[PDB]
Amino acid sequence: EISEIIKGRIEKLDVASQARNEGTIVSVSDGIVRIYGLADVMYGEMIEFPGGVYGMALNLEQDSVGAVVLGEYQGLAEG
């Protein structure tokens, strides 16, 4: 069992809470994008990226979302 002093140190940690409707890009390759954190995304849902670009959710895995870009992907970047 973890100690009360260690539990206090854990409550002080800089851990950023993320909304269930938002995510962060992990990788970009040949029109396919990998995203981290879109917790409430549905299979076949439209994903909105900056600069007016849209994606479609195809792979919903345990740790990440795989999406196909509905236009030009060369303007998309990690983070």
Partner: protein, 456 residues
Amino acid sequence: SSGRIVQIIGAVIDVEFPRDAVPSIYEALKVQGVETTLEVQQQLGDGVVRSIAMGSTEGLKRGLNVDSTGAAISVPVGKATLGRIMDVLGNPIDEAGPIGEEERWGIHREAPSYADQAGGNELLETGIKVIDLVCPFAKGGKVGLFGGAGVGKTVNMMELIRNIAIEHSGYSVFAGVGERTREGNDFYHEMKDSNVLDKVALVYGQMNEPPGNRLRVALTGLTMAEKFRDEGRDVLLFIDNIYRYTLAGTEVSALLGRMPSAVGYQPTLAEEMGVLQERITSTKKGSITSIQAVYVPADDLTDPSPATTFAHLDATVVLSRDIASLGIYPAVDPLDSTSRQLDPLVIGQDHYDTARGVQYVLQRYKELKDIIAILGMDELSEADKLLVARARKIQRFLSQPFFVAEVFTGSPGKYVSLKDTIAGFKGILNGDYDHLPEQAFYMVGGIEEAVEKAKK
């Protein structure tokens, strides 16, 4: 208890359950907010199971709750299914209200044992010349109609449903596996207007449907046929296209984590085929006569799916595109088509020798094709010239106008008895018709009509 969706990839879904409440293989599950049904395929470990959705996955998300039903997909069976249309899950899809079912059966079962097998050899007349001559069918046996796209399989089957229902007095079961929705509508209204509908059970899972539906519809229709067989009845089981059951399995195989085999097929191709095909059999209790259409990808009969299907059938009817191109219908190939009933001890020596005589003439004509193409017929021997002339007449006499093909051309349909079929081909082989013109044999039913057609 209940689980939670952990992953979604197309038609395949992974669900996590408590370690003491993990559902069994083939067990049915239901998603709480949409009521979508899932069938468990395998247990991955750590309480996680992999399943195929029996509907669309659009709009589903990770974290949704899932309920285990404690049993496999169960469908209604018995007299209440006659004259009704059902989906893969046994729900009515004809707008005629709920099914008045007395009991439900799970769609997964083992095949009847080796000691339960039936040794039937009773001949079934189809009224179609080429089939009754070289591909004789038997009551309680299995037939396969092999062919590429647009060669005649749905027409040549519907003509068999029309002709076999003349002598048969029992029930029929029809399973539509991955084909046109319009043809299911045409067949339903045709039987409803003809008053034939109250003796047929209809199940559908057409091309518009997701992979899970197309993969399990065959099992749902067969489960209804097995209820009637086990009641001691003689029933007919029609499968619109058995290849679609295997194809639906190929679309899902890579998602199930399996390594692919030759030409991209699932590694389980022969086992998936045997588990279904062995249930479609006659037993000591009752009989199932079954007719199945088998699609041939890109006209290749050596493709793994068609190649694996031949061993499961008693009669094999092979349709050809080269024959259909000449104008001949039904486009059956006598040299590639065969039956277990084509034996002197089953059909008698007169039929057997007529069929063997026709095949010998057609085989010898096929050997001369390249010589005739370069140098023409005039260079052949006086014996080969006479044989080629009889081969051309036999090839045309095998054609026949059908009662379901009347809309395409206008000509009235013909039913030819086995006696008339043997008499016509025996006469052409003996040379009794050497003087009549070659076009007199094309589209005429019985041999006497070739004599009347030659008068014009």
